[PDB]
Amino acid sequence: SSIRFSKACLKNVFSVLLIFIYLLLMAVAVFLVYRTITDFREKLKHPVMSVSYKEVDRYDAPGIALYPGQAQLLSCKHHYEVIPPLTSPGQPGDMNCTTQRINYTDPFSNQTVKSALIVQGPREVKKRELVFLQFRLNKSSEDFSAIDYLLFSSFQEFLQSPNRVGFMQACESAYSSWKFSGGFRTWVKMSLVKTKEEDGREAVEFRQETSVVNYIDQRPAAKKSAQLFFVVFEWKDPFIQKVQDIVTANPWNTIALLCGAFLALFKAAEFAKLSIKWMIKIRKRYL
Amino acid sequence: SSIRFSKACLKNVFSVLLIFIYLLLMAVAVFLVYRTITDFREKLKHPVMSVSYKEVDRYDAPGIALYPGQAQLLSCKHHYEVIPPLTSPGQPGDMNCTTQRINYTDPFSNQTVKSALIVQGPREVKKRELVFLQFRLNKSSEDFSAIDYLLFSSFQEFLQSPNRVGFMQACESAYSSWKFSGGFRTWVKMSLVKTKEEDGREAVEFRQETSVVNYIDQRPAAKKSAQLFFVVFEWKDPFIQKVQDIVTANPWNTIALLCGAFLALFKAAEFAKLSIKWMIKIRKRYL
Amino acid sequence: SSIRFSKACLKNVFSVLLIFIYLLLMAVAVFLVYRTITDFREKLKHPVMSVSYKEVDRYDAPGIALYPGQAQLLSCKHHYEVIPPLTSPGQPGDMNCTTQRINYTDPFSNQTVKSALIVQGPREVKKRELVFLQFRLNKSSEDFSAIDYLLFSSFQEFLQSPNRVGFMQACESAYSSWKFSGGFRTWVKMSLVKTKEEDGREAVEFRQETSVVNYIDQRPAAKKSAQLFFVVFEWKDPFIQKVQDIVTANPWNTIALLCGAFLALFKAAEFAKLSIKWMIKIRKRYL
Ligand SMILES: *[C@@H]1O[C@H](CO)[C@@H](O[C@@H]2O[C@H](CO)[C@@H](O)[C@H](O)[C@H]2NC(C)=O)[C@H](O)[C@H]1NC(C)=O
Ligand SMILES: *[C@@H]1O[C@H](CO)[C@@H](O[C@@H]2O[C@H](CO)[C@@H](O)[C@H](O)[C@H]2NC(C)=O)[C@H](O)[C@H]1NC(C)=O
Ligand SMILES: *[C@@H]1O[C@H](CO)[C@@H](O[C@@H]2O[C@H](CO)[C@@H](O)[C@H](O)[C@H]2NC(C)=O)[C@H](O)[C@H]1NC(C)=O
Ligand SMILES: *[C@@H]1O[C@H](CO)[C@@H](O)[C@H](O)[C@H]1NC(C)=O
Ligand SMILES: *[C@@H]1O[C@H](CO)[C@@H](O)[C@H](O)[C@H]1NC(C)=O
Ligand SMILES: *[C@@H]1O[C@H](CO)[C@@H](O)[C@H](O)[C@H]1NC(C)=O
Ligand SMILES: *[C@@H]1O[C@H](CO)[C@@H](O)[C@H](O)[C@H]1NC(C)=O
Ligand SMILES: *[C@@H]1O[C@H](CO)[C@@H](O)[C@H](O)[C@H]1NC(C)=O
Ligand SMILES: *[C@@H]1O[C@H](CO)[C@@H](O)[C@H](O)[C@H]1NC(C)=O
Ligand SMILES: *[C@@H]1O[C@H](CO)[C@@H](O)[C@H](O)[C@H]1NC(C)=O
Ligand SMILES: *[C@@H]1O[C@H](CO)[C@@H](O)[C@H](O)[C@H]1NC(C)=O
Numbered sequence A, B, C: 001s002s003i004r005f006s007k008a009c010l011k012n013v014f015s016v017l018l019i020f021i022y023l024l025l026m027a028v029a030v031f032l033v034y035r036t037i038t039d040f041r042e043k044l045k046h047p048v049m050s051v052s053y054k055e056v057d058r059y060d061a062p063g064i065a066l067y068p069g070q071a072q073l074l075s076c077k078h079h080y081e082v083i084p085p086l087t088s089p090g091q092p093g094d095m096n097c098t099t100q101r102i103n104y105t106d107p108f109s110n111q112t113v114k115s116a117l118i119v120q121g122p123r124e125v126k127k128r129e130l131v132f133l134q135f136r137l138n139k140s141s142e143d144f145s146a147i148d149y150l151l152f153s154s155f156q157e158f159l160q161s162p163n164r165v166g167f168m169q170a171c172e173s174a175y176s177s178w179k180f181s182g183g184f185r186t187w188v189k190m191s192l193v194k195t196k197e198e199d200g201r202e203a204v205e206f207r208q209e210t211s212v213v214n215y216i217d218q219r220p221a222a223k224k225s226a227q228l229f230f231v232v233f234e235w236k237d238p239f240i241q242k243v244q245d246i247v248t249a250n251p252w253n254t255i256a257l258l259c260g261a262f263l264a265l266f267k268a269a270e271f272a273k274l275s276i277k278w279m280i281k282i283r284k285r286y287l
């Protein structure tokens, strides 16, 4: 009796189930062909990459592979406010810092062993956290008051990574080395750029806009006169700049093109069936 | 008589009206769902943003919140050509400049009141306009020949904005502060990056590539020997770098995905009706 | 006999030929309308451009338009390793370099003739190639130990370009000039940004993150005391940053939108035919 009437609603619910099953079939189809696109993009070298910024509230505290060598750290003290207060130059102490000394061999050197110091840099951008590393060095024949410094992604990873020697060589091969001057401060407003490799590894690079400021020799005011170094590391922007393959990093566009492509193939097949019918009518007109 | 023949053209014009009304319906549909997408993207925090350059012929003259404090401006003179001509160091005058002195409290300080000077920076990029601000400072205990400087979007806005104290605190919270050295020029080839917030406010940041050049003490050649400061502000590139939410800044792509989505739902519903007919034929084959 | 049976396969092959011919027709259609979009985008001024990185294994060795003028080059020697070894300051020789001296008139000057030196900069990024140009200059009245330097795309082009004067003026109009200090090294980790103009010309710009490091006067240790200059040019990143019109540089997205548009017009026309049939049924219900 009422089954004949409820057959309409049953057919309607079966119809919506058909809608959604064909949606899921089309979705898995575009998913598979897009996975094929991605796994082919992987196989090729040097793909045109996009750019993408991701505003971050607090960074991951990075490493600062200072290369003092013969020099020594004189003071390390984070400073929330944007102003590092008055100091006492040439006087050690106040090394309120979390450092590690690591030795390794530079791959490009492969014959020179250099000693590296590490520092947990600033991680609170909005708070304007900045680490002030003050150094000192008695006169040497280096002809240049210079010590280098690297910058890798996160210090927590360097703590929680085995084989720190190899990871240090890896972060040395990275394009984020720099040499801050000796004899005056070098405010280093670093910023991060995370590139995703074709293999998938998240290689990181930094992009620092230094601002050197002279060091008044009236402050030391001593007959010691040893080249003493200063840095202020802080984050320029809260926009971590990640880049990846143009298609992979913005999939919702290549999948849009793939839906366009499949729908166009479908539609053009429907139009071709219509054209077959039209040609059949034209042939029947000949008789 | 002829009405029966003109009925064909009437039906054709009504048909094209149907084409365009269904186009406008589909357009308002994708517009509404895309507005929903945007107003949801607003609700979330830290969305992956795109990047976009917009070549500009003439910039808006920006503010340069110089923080001399105890120091004083010695000369300000724009220079169209790429070369600032020979000067007379240590001699005031020629302050051919449009400055304003503003006092406020730094939010991170909140207990230190600092005095700020403002300068209408260069706005003609192609002409290579560059403002040369020359300073001077008698010896202090600051231990560092340093005065800071900010950079906000436009000086015309700072003129036409009420409550300059609050706007100055806001532009101070921005990530565009810098400290140019004292004792030698600091060519500051600044460039602008306008980020659009999730709320919609157009936050601006600068990205300066300084190039410090030493100041030959043979030029002053006086027993005064006061740390005197120099800057040359100019625009690096004419490409103002604006960034916004990946979807919002490039809508023509997410709307393309939405047209793909609606057309795919339509088509898959048509295919599901075809499958219903096929299943009905299969059931009729059973009898 | 068997022709009646093979007619099915013949119709099927003709059908697939219809599929592909209508695909090619639709493809040429979207190609033509997209070419129209591009040739209109050309006609307009200042289009919002995208950004795109392209990892490069070896750069094209660029020119370094050093402007010493009265000064002189003291040593030029590429160095694969990341370390320039110990030197002998103030002593000429070892100019293991490929330079050219070119004279021209600065367009903004148009009355001052300046002499330019060119250097084949580093081109091997992964090898960390870096050119160290050491200079010297006896005391002058320039009041500033400064000599400028430009950076254009490739030195091979400057060798293989006629009218080097005009090309030098063109690369001078480019936004890639800089002034490295005198009296201490200036490590210049340059990087390249190739912008594609609306006309189509591939304008190049550089983006250098210098890192000045002081020059210990204990190394010269002579009563000569002439301001002598130092630079170390190397590539910051292997990601050449090319930018072009938002649509032109990423066509596969605007063509996706165009396929969406054409398919939507088609579908909405089909739906309008269905609505015509529905209105005809509604009118027949009136009788
Ligand atoms: C890492 O290398 C540094 C030098 O590059 C080593 O420093 C030496 O440390 C010992 C202490 O055991 C001192 O007696 C030596 O005088 C130091 N060398 C010099 C040249 O002064 C250091 O030992 C190495 N290992 C570690 C773990 O730091
Ligand atoms: C803004 O602050 C500055 C100092 O930060 C004030 O400078 C003082 O100006 C008065 C003039 O009325 C002088 O007599 C004082 O000597 C200045 N101070 C110092 C420490 O020298 C200034 O008055 C404040 N207001 C304005 C509008 O600039
Ligand atoms: C390019 O300009 C430079 C100066 O800007 C010229 O240098 C002169 O070279 C001659 C050699 O023929 C010397 O006798 C002069 O003393 C140099 N000038 C000065 C001021 O010292 C140079 O000749 C010009 N042409 C070329 C091809 O370099
Ligand atoms: C570093 O400073 C903090 C301030 O909160 C203090 O608690 C800590 O003991 C200091 N570390 C050393 C080694 O003095
Ligand atoms: C690195 O050093 C080793 C010595 O153990 C040597 O055999 C190898 O050739 C060197 N490689 C390079 C690239 O210099
Ligand atoms: C550097 O010289 C000073 C001389 O005042 C001396 O006190 C200090 O110990 C020396 N540095 C080192 C690391 O020995
Ligand atoms: C600044 O220079 C311009 C040059 O056009 C001149 O007209 C103006 O009077 C000068 N201002 C002052 C205060 O001398
Ligand atoms: C700012 O200063 C006021 C004093 O009026 C104080 O009450 C407030 O706690 C301070 N805020 C911060 C964040 O230091
Ligand atoms: C700085 O000292 C000089 C001494 O020659 C003096 O003329 C000048 O007035 C002083 N500066 C100020 C701001 O008083
Ligand atoms: C430069 O150095 C290379 C080292 O391979 C050498 O072959 C060449 O002769 C040198 N050039 C000059 C002019 O000495
Ligand atoms: C460039 O110099 C020429 C002299 O031959 C002069 O006629 C012309 O007006 C100048 N152009 C500019 C823009 O200064």
Ligand SMILES: *[C@@H]1O[C@H](CO)[C@@H](O)[C@H](O)[C@H]1NC(C)=O
Residues within 6 Å of the ligand: C072, C138, C224
């Ligand atoms: C600079 O002066 C020195 C004096 O020792 C002289 O030997 C040298 O030739 C001078 N430079 C030039 C370019 O004449």
